[PDB]
Amino acid sequence: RTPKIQVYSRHPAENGKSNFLNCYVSGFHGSDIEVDLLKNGERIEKVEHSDLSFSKDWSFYLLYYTEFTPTEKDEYACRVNHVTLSQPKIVKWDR
Amino acid sequence: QVQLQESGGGSVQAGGSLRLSCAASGYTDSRYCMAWFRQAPGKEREWVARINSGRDITYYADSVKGRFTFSQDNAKNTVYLQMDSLEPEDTATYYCATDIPLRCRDIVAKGGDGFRYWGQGTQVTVSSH
Structure with a gap:
């Protein structure tokens, strides 16, 4: 019915090195x-x-x-708006 | 330029509720992110909460999670922080901080304090029985 959202990084995250942040919908x-x-x-x-x-x-x-x-402390998330959604869905990155 | 409107502090019985309020005039497109800190006697400064410029993401300090919640007014001009289930340890002066989204993006969510524009502070005193 409504969208499935996953939020994840291309690698096991380590701070100060270059990785990618993905949102799959x-x-x-x-x-x-x-x-x-x-x-x-x-x-x-x-x-x-x-x-x-x-x-x-x-x-x-x-x-x-x-x-x-x-970094240690920067927080990252995905936001998705869709007709099926009365109000936008947020998914926070975790690790 | 940017003018803060920050209010709601005063005296409350423990277990009671109290709604703090913040808004700012002068921002381009009225777009600005916002956080709350408090300063209590005998402790360092403590970050309380953060909401983004779009107003649909909130981070709260573990210390207040489940107790404090952001809402907006009908008109959408002002943001409220509803504080329920207050304890004496929440006695402090609370301050809000604002800045443009471009800078806010780099102000870390839990703790970051690089905001240019702050309130003078509103005091909340939580007494026991």
């Missing part, structure tokens, strides 16, 4: 959908994504990603 009827990556709750500027979509059942598979250098 999947569901149905995506033409409208808006996905942001967040650092300390504010949008990350340069972010890329790859989209895969099928008309038969209107399924979609999106992957938003950014090269980032994690």
Whole structure:
């Protein structure tokens, strides 16, 4: 029904080295959908994504990603707006 | 330029509730992130809470998690921090801090204090029975 969201880094995170932060989103009827990556709750500027979509059942598979250098204390999250959602869903990165 | 509106402090019986309030005029597009610190007698400064400029992400100090919650007014101009289940240890002066999203992004969420624009502080005194 509503989108599935996973948030995870390309590697076991270590601080001061370069890794990638991924947001995988999947569901149905995506033409409208808006996905942001967040650092300390504010949008990350340069972010890329790859989209895969099928008309038969209107399924979609999106992957938003950014090269980032994690630290001890910087918090990172994914935000997703969709029609099915009355209010945007947030998923916090964990480790 | 940026003017803070910060309010709500006063005296409360322990176990009671108290709503702090913050807003700021002067920001471009009224877009600004916001955090609360408090200073109590006998302790260092303590970070309490943080909300982002879009107002849909909140981080809280473990010390207040489950007790303190951000909300917004109907008009959306002001942000509230609802403090329930107050204890005497929460007696302190509370301050809010604001800055533009571009800077806020690099101000660490739990603890970061690099905000340019602060309130003078509102005092909360939590007495026992």
